[PDB]
């Protein structure tokens, strides 16, 4: 996964 996409929708 990631990791570089914070939050709800990235």
């Amino acid at each position, epitope marked *: *996964g*990631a*990791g*570089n*996409q*914070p*939050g*709800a929708n*990235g």
Partner: antibody
Amino acid sequence: QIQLVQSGPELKKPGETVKISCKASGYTFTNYGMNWVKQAPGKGLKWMGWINSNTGEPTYAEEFKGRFAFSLETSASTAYLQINNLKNEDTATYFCARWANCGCAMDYWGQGTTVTVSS
Amino acid sequence: DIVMTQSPSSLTVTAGEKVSMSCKSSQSLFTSGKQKNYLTWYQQKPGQPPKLLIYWASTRNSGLPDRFTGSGSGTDFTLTISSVQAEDLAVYYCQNDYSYPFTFGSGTKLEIKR
């Protein structure tokens, strides 16, 4: 065995410029974005922003837009925070912190860098 | 944006007791699709960086003792300590992680009566 090591404390005059390094080791660097957090002396925590380790794209909180720059050096697994035109309000400790693999929390933290702005 | 109001600012308890700290939002922190909460609890002992305690509002981090339980959802959250030991003197911070900007709370400072 994952460590974030930040550069040492610095004294800078008002108007001068500072760069803080954050060398990470122990994980694949370009898979975890890097956050910065401000703590004024004796005061609480404020989230400054984060930078994408993969793409390079920074994202700043509204208070830190304009005088603050996030950058990366991927070949050295090191994130950088730069503060321009230093003011008195910038005396604080600055933490670098890593996004967890969830994307829901900040997992590993550096030990902080204290900047003192004084003539 | 999400303002995180924490309560009370400082609270004092006797060693061994159980206590409650509150974290309240402006807007809800619920995904509506993943049915998971994007709230995180952090602990800052004096002179240290913050330490990750609880992510997803109740899931504990690796290596944590079983005396910290927070289980809220929506806009009302609480962090509770089962037996306060002397090593738990610290400031506790909640963080919104649902959307930018990923705001912190003001902090609850927990002190011991002996």
